[PDB]
Design a protein around this ligand. Structure first.
Ligand SMILES: NC[C@@H]1O[C@H](O[C@H]2[C@@H](O)[C@H](O[C@@H]3[C@@H](O)[C@H](N)C[C@H](N)[C@H]3O[C@H]3O[C@H](CO)[C@@H](O)[C@H](O)[C@H]3N)O[C@@H]2CO)[C@H](N)[C@@H](O)[C@@H]1O
Ligand SMILES: NC[C@@H]1O[C@H](O[C@H]2[C@@H](O)[C@H](O[C@@H]3[C@@H](O)[C@H](N)C[C@H](N)[C@H]3O[C@H]3O[C@H](CO)[C@@H](O)[C@H](O)[C@H]3N)O[C@@H]2CO)[C@H](N)[C@@H](O)[C@@H]1O
Ligand SMILES: [K+]
Ligand SMILES: [K+]
Ligand SMILES: [K+]
Ligand SMILES: [K+]
Ligand SMILES: [K+]
Ligand SMILES: [K+]
Ligand SMILES: [K+]
Ligand SMILES: [K+]
Ligand SMILES: [K+]
Ligand SMILES: [Mg+2]
Ligand SMILES: [Mg+2]
Ligand SMILES: [Mg+2]
Ligand SMILES: [Mg+2]
Ligand SMILES: [Mg+2]
Ligand SMILES: [Mg+2]
Ligand SMILES: [Mg+2]
Ligand SMILES: [Mg+2]
Ligand SMILES: [Mg+2]
Ligand SMILES: [Mg+2]
Ligand SMILES: [Mg+2]
Ligand SMILES: [Mg+2]
Ligand SMILES: [Mg+2]
Ligand SMILES: [Mg+2]
Ligand SMILES: [Mg+2]
Ligand SMILES: [Mg+2]
Ligand SMILES: [Mg+2]
Ligand SMILES: [Mg+2]
Ligand SMILES: [Mg+2]
Ligand SMILES: [Mg+2]
Ligand SMILES: [Mg+2]
Ligand SMILES: [Mg+2]
Ligand SMILES: [Mg+2]
Ligand SMILES: [Mg+2]
Ligand SMILES: [Mg+2]
Ligand SMILES: [Mg+2]
Ligand SMILES: [Mg+2]
Ligand SMILES: [Mg+2]
Ligand SMILES: [Mg+2]
Ligand SMILES: [Mg+2]
Ligand SMILES: [Mg+2]
Ligand SMILES: [Mg+2]
Ligand SMILES: [Mg+2]
Ligand SMILES: [Mg+2]
Ligand SMILES: [Mg+2]
Ligand SMILES: [Mg+2]
Ligand SMILES: [Mg+2]
Ligand SMILES: [Mg+2]
Ligand SMILES: [Mg+2]
Ligand SMILES: [Mg+2]
Ligand SMILES: [Mg+2]
Ligand SMILES: [Mg+2]
Ligand SMILES: [Mg+2]
Ligand SMILES: [Mg+2]
Ligand SMILES: [Mg+2]
Ligand SMILES: [Mg+2]
Ligand SMILES: [Mg+2]
Ligand SMILES: [Mg+2]
Ligand SMILES: [Mg+2]
Ligand SMILES: [Mg+2]
Ligand SMILES: [Mg+2]
Ligand SMILES: [Mg+2]
Ligand SMILES: [Mg+2]
Ligand SMILES: [Mg+2]
Ligand SMILES: [Mg+2]
Ligand SMILES: [Mg+2]
Ligand SMILES: [Mg+2]
Ligand SMILES: [Mg+2]
Ligand SMILES: [Mg+2]
Ligand SMILES: [Mg+2]
Ligand SMILES: [Mg+2]
Ligand SMILES: [Mg+2]
Ligand SMILES: [Mg+2]
Ligand SMILES: [Mg+2]
Ligand SMILES: [Mg+2]
Ligand SMILES: [Mg+2]
Ligand SMILES: [Mg+2]
Ligand SMILES: [Mg+2]
Ligand SMILES: [Mg+2]
Ligand SMILES: [Mg+2]
Ligand SMILES: [Mg+2]
Ligand SMILES: [Mg+2]
Ligand SMILES: [Mg+2]
Ligand SMILES: [Mg+2]
Ligand SMILES: [Mg+2]
Ligand SMILES: [Mg+2]
Ligand SMILES: [Mg+2]
Ligand SMILES: [Mg+2]
Ligand SMILES: [Mg+2]
Ligand SMILES: [Mg+2]
Ligand SMILES: [Mg+2]
Ligand code: NA
Ligand code: NA
Ligand code: NA
Ligand code: NA
Ligand code: NA
Ligand code: NA
Ligand code: NA
Ligand code: NA
Ligand code: NA
Ligand code: NA
Ligand code: NA
Ligand SMILES: [Zn+2]
Lengths: 258, 89
RNA sequence: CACCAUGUUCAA
RNA sequence: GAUUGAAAAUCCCCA
RNA sequence: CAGAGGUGAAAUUCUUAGACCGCACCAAGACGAACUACAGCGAAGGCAUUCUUCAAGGAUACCUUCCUCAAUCAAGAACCAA
RNA sequence: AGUGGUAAUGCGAAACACUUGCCAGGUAACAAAUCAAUCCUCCCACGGUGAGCUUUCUUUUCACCAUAAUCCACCUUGGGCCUUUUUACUUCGCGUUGUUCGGAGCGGGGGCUCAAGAUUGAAAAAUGCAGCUCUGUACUGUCAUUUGUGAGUUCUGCGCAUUAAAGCAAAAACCUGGGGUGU
RNA sequence: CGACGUCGCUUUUUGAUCCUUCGAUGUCGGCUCUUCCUAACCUAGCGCCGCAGAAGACGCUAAGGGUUGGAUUGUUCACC
RNA sequence: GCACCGUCUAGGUUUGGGAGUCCCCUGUGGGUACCCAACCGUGCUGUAAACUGAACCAACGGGAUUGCAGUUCCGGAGUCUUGUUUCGAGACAUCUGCCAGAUGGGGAGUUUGGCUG
RNA sequence: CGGGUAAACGGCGGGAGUAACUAUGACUCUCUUAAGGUAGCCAAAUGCCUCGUCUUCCAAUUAGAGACGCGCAUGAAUGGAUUAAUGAGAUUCCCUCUGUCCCGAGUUACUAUCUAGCGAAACGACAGUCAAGGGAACGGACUUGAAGGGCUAAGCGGGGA
RNA sequence: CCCAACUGCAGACCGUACUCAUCACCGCAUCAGGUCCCCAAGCAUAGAAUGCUCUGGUACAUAGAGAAAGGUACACUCAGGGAAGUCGGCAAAAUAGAUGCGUAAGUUCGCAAGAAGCAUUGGCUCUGAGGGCAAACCACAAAUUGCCAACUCAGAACUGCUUACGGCGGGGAAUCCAACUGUAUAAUUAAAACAUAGGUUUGU
RNA sequence: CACGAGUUGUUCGGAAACUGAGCACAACGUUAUAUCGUUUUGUUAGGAAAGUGAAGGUGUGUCGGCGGGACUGGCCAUAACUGAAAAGGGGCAACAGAGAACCUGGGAUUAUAUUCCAAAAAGAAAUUGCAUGUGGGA
RNA sequence: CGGGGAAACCCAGGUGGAGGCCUGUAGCGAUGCUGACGUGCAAAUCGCUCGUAUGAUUUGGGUAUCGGAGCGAAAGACUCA
């Protein structure tokens, strides 16, 4: 046999990110002394689009806390961010859309985005267009905050981890039918080399477990074990269930009783 | 005079892609190409310049909101909630 | 509150 | 013929 | 701790891997009991916890205004439980 | 140790000078279609020089009629802006071929500025080309010495500028300012 | 014409066999074209009949000459 | 047991004490309204709806060598370190090696009788 | 061992009787599965029988179309059915058109053909007229007969298995 | 020491011929194959279609003689019939531009559609229409007066055809398959295969 | 085939001297063995990779100002003691991207020319680097 | 810009220039003749004809990914006949 396509992509090569024309990683500003004790006020200078990202990006200009210069951070703009808006970031920042506050300072039931999974990680959750997290509750005894992630899972994080008030801009993108293969071609131009997609049954058996046969068919069950080696782990990986879901979509992902 | 009975802007696609996919795309396409009210400057001059990016031809303000409309209903709900929670504090 | 289905055609 | 008020029905190639 | 459920009687079902039952909670989606009436409101369909709000609507009151501006209606329009 | 203009913004012979201590912007730096379109090309009229044809026609046919950079001085078109008048939109006006615009300042008057040209000279006839004259010279005197509301042409007007779930490289180098120095 | 039986011929069918060919003999049908065979369809003669005539059956000598156009099917074949 | 290491504060509230409105003309310019203690607070000069200003290379005040300029330091800009850059986790695995097992056509090697009209 | 899961792989029955002519079987009995093929669709690019049967198309149709369904062995994201537009895709008929054909004829350029110059390859046991006979069962050599004067040019595809 | 207008001196290194192809590169070769960029005239015409032409380039690609059969062709024609040929309309024929009229079933309302069909077209001599430019607070037929460029369309009379360059769709009624545009076995398979948007499921 | 000749640049192309998709020296780690890996998401390496230098103190020279060529507050250059500030090593990769100061005329060739032309350079320019003098300031 | 209408809205003329839209060059391909050639011009070419030709478009240079591996809109295609 030969290496399966899913294994080949792990080598990198021609399947890596088309990072040219991207503006750079989008993040909150560094959790410095000013954020931990007071606040830093910035100004939104531009709202920009980056190839491969549905959400709009905001360039926010701050003064350097220690030097005579400016910083010009780049963040994922929440819905409603506008040029000239004042962005407040810190412990003492007021509760308003676009401001960055510690989670412990944000009232329960609020809608947040750009949530730090770890304090100081500069935003790792609720970043894709139209997504948000919901603050469930605060637990001061352990200093944790419970959140509802966009996928539906509930996650506890330290209350010093920051979040941005609002929802990610650009929501509703997936509601418009593509209607053309060419539009998908342009969609994936800025992301990576992963389109078009050839079905495994259309390939030959040398390069895919589903290949071959005098009829186009998978001759074995497509649910494969979690422990299957690469090259054999294709199809529905470790599926707890299959078939059309009826009577309610359960929350996907791993089960965390905590 | 009217040039199409019901297709409207989708008539550039001819007979392709199906009626229902055309209808669903049309609602969002009209919205994304339409002029939207600007709360600043009080004009109907907001136009999209990229997915999620809107610039007002009147006051030149740029606002990040909505893939195909200036503001999504979820954002309106979030705006009221944040204002209410801010008053509560 | 277990289970009760049916009655050939005219005409007295 | 039995019964009936009269009847039904019933009985007495290769490639 | 040994049954529970369900029925005319049963069985499908749940249960020592602790069901049913008991207490205080938590989550989520519906619903707004009794009060509820030959009672109210609405053009009909319909409408029932509280508080804060946004436009209405009828009736009543008037020595206000006005001056026939009305009634009913093919076509046409809007609404319409499940 | 700059200076004028109500303003848009103007002024250069060397104090309007130094700024890689530092800071901030700009140039470099990118983009459809429609419509106008540059240099040049082609075609028409116009007039010279030579050549072709001329039983018969043809005030004819053909060729040519060129001005490189670098500079000086300073009417047309398009854009941005300033000042003035704003009683500019009550059952409105300006403008494009074209999907616009205006009390967040339209139109009218008068101005400032930018971008393309046009024009004036210096360069520059001393050059180039053709014809022709005379005397054996690759000799020598001399004469010729522009019009188009035509058709093309992406230079340009032209971008926060194209379909877009597509939104269209970067840097060196350079420019200007903020501060400070001069003080 | 010929049951029950019985004796043959033919190689225009299939089968049986594996002698020749696996350092290869191009494997279906049609088209085209020539020739040969006779167990004779037509054509030339001749017997015989349950041969009146007409139309036919059977048989003899004879292969000189002739033996088609089309629909469906790749078809040979089949059918119209 | 006692003492030493061991020291200070924005702001908020309430307890004691001392001690200095004026020029020019109704208006303008300049300036004064303090210090300490106790409790809370914990390092705290700015924002509580958001539409785009500017912030550097110290002013100033003290202690020594009237006012002024020099050379020093010290404040302005608190002090300290049984020490960890900070945060999160934490003696488990999200870690490291070994031993042991299960799974494992993802992959390797090999095999897949004979007689035979 | 105990649960879940088919838009996971996949799967989705047989026999007997029965209605006042006859036939047919709404109906009934019985054996049995994890479930016994539902909505649809079809002699379909899926039907062995098969050139199925009916209708239509032609003078004549193993073809085409429309129906029928005992479906050797149709069938639902192993996707079922339908489908305007689109297609160098597979099929049938009609109009137009014609040398495709009845049935062949004439013309042209370049060849072949002849010449000047130039000048190969494949192939080559030896060779090269037939009939029959035997033979390794299909001879150019052998047996017996019949032919055969020698050397050349252009063709041709019977043989040289 | 900083400037302005001059001026004086000095401005190093490598590449530079020729070719870029029906002979200079690759394909064994001066091989009808392959190979990126710039400049691109006149006429007809919608024109970078196609035909011919000034400038530039060229007659280089073995030739001569010359109606045998049979061939090849980026060559034609054929009376009467018209697919009877053939597995099969293969091949060929046919349709043809522009303008006006007219156009069925079906349909996702966009199409189907150039559906199908009918008619006109030359030459010549005229007529009409479509403009630019310039000029003496009321209202004022500059609602006329001159001069002029570049073209198009329409309508008439007369007079022709041998239907006559090039270039340029045949059409209709149905069945099967794939939605469509695309991709794809370089050198026998271009399709119904792959992709596609859409739909669903899984892991996180 | 033989012999003899031809390619002339301050401005044209490249380089000196930009970044791009990328490459991988150092550094570190790995491997029995480096002939392996990391090395642009602002960016090497547990990582001390800056030799550069603002304001100053010390001498020389060029100056403006006062007082009596020199003498002191003040300016600017020249060498030396410190010492603000600068985080992220060294390079390659575009002859179509960025960048780039020259144009015509010619009788100047058998062949090179925006490359050759010499005092009437046929000539007209542009742009560098150092200098002198003139003039204006310090 | 007109024409209807009580209203909601509808009808007609022009302007405009959209499309993995159509005809058709260059370009990029390769259907049929099962044509030519088949010791060829050619170890895949030639002719007519044909697909497409504003896009999932064609192309230069540079750069990146290979040998039980690379790459593949998937033909076991392609990785110097
Ligand atoms: N350290 C060796 C490297 O491990 C990598 O692979 C390792 C990881 O993929 C994987 O590590 C997993 C980790 O994914 C997962 N998130 C957690 C799990 N505990 C780890 O497991 C590993 O680490 C633990 C240490 O406690 C060991 O006990 C265990 O044996 C080991 N398999 O286990 C593999 C074996 O260690 C490389 N693929 C491999 O080539 C290389 O050998
Ligand atoms: N609704 C589903 C139920 O199943 C029934 O199914 C019926 C049929 O579909 C089925 O019969 C089979 C079927 O299994 C199979 N898949 C196809 C076969 N052709 C059918 O056969 C049936 O249908 C054809 C057509 O009319 C008849 O000619 C035939 O006589 C009849 N036996 O079995 C039942 C025969 O009575 C009916 N669809 C319907 O009446 C009933 O409600
Ligand atoms: K092991
Ligand atoms: K295995
Ligand atoms: K089946
Ligand atoms: K098409
Ligand atoms: K013999
Ligand atoms: K002829
Ligand atoms: K319809
Ligand atoms: K394919
Ligand atoms: K491909
Ligand atoms: Mg990458
Ligand atoms: Mg696919
Ligand atoms: Mg395949
Ligand atoms: Mg396999
Ligand atoms: Mg398979
Ligand atoms: Mg399939
Ligand atoms: Mg399948
Ligand atoms: Mg009764
Ligand atoms: Mg109640
Ligand atoms: Mg009424
Ligand atoms: Mg309902
Ligand atoms: Mg720009
Ligand atoms: Mg660029
Ligand atoms: Mg107005
Ligand atoms: Mg343009
Ligand atoms: Mg017998
Ligand atoms: Mg044998
Ligand atoms: Mg053999
Ligand atoms: Mg042999
Ligand atoms: Mg043979
Ligand atoms: Mg005989
Ligand atoms: Mg005979
Ligand atoms: Mg004979
Ligand atoms: Mg720690
Ligand atoms: Mg194996
Ligand atoms: Mg054997
Ligand atoms: Mg009976
Ligand atoms: Mg059942
Ligand atoms: Mg069937
Ligand atoms: Mg069939
Ligand atoms: Mg037929
Ligand atoms: Mg049928
Ligand atoms: Mg199913
Ligand atoms: Mg199937
Ligand atoms: Mg096709
Ligand atoms: Mg031999
Ligand atoms: Mg013989
Ligand atoms: Mg022999
Ligand atoms: Mg032969
Ligand atoms: Mg040269
Ligand atoms: Mg040269
Ligand atoms: Mg060339
Ligand atoms: Mg060649
Ligand atoms: Mg070679
Ligand atoms: Mg013309
Ligand atoms: Mg041409
Ligand atoms: Mg032409
Ligand atoms: Mg030649
Ligand atoms: Mg030749
Ligand atoms: Mg004929
Ligand atoms: Mg006919
Ligand atoms: Mg036929
Ligand atoms: Mg026939
Ligand atoms: Mg026939
Ligand atoms: Mg046939
Ligand atoms: Mg044909
Ligand atoms: Mg119709
Ligand atoms: Mg298709
Ligand atoms: Mg289909
Ligand atoms: Mg196409
Ligand atoms: Mg296609
Ligand atoms: Mg092939
Ligand atoms: Mg093929
Ligand atoms: Mg092919
Ligand atoms: Mg030589
Ligand atoms: Mg790079
Ligand atoms: Mg990296
Ligand atoms: Mg590091
Ligand atoms: Mg370089
Ligand atoms: Mg360049
Ligand atoms: Mg240069
Ligand atoms: Mg010249
Ligand atoms: Mg000359
Ligand atoms: Mg030359
Ligand atoms: Mg197209
Ligand atoms: Mg096309
Ligand atoms: Mg190519
Ligand atoms: Mg052939
Ligand atoms: Mg041949
Ligand atoms: Mg031949
Ligand atoms: Mg295969
Ligand atoms: Na199977
Ligand atoms: Na319990
Ligand atoms: Na004005
Ligand atoms: Na044999
Ligand atoms: Na006879
Ligand atoms: Na049957
Ligand atoms: Na024999
Ligand atoms: Na030589
Ligand atoms: Na010179
Ligand atoms: Na080409
Ligand atoms: Na590898
Ligand atoms: Zn606005």
């Amino acid at each position: 046999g030969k290496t399966v396509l899913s294994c080949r992509k792990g080598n990198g090569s021609v399947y890596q990110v088309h990072g040219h024309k991207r503006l750079g990683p989008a993040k909150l500003r560094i959790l410095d002394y000013a954020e931990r004790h007071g606040y830093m006020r910035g100004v939104v200078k531009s709202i920009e689009h980056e190839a491969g990202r549905g959400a709009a990006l905001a360039r926010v200009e701050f003064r350097h806390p220690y030097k005579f210069r400016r910083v010009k951070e780049l963040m994922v703009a929440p819905e409603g961010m506008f040029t000239g808006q004042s962005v407040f970031c810190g412990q003492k920042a007021p509760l308003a859309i676009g401001n960055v506050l510690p989670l412990g300072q944000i009232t329960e039931g609020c809608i947040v985005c750009n949530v730090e999974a770890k304090p100081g990680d500069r935003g790792t959750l609720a970043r894709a267009s139209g997504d948000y997290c919901i603050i469930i509750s605060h637990n001061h005894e352990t200093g944790r905050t419970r959140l509802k992630l966009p996928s539906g899972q509930k996650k506890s994080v330290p209350s010093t981890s920051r979040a941005m008030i609002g929802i990610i801009s650009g929501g509703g993108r997936i509601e418009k039918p593509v209607l053309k293969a060419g539009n998908s071609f342009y969609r994936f131009r800025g992301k990576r080399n992963c389109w078009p997609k050839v079905r495994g049954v259309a390939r030959n058996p040398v390069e895919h477990p589903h290949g071959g046969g005098n009829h186009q068919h998978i001759g074995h069950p497509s649910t494969v074990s979690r422990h299957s080696p690469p090259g054999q782990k294709v199809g529905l990986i470790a599926a707890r269930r299959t078939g059309r879901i009826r009577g309610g979509k359960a929350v996907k992902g791993a089960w965390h009783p905590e | 005079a009217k040039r199409t009975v019901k297709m409207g802007v989708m008539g550039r696609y001819g007979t392709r892609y199906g009626a229902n996919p055309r209808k669903r795309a049309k609602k969002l396409e009209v919205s994304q190409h339409a002029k939207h009210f600007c709360s600043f400057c009080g004009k109907f001059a907001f136009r999209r310049k990229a997915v999620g990016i809107w610039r007002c031809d009147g006051c030149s303000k740029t606002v990040a909101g909505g893939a195909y409309t200036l503001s999504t209903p979820n954002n309106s709900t979030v705006r009221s909630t944040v204002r209410r929670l801010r008053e509560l504090a």
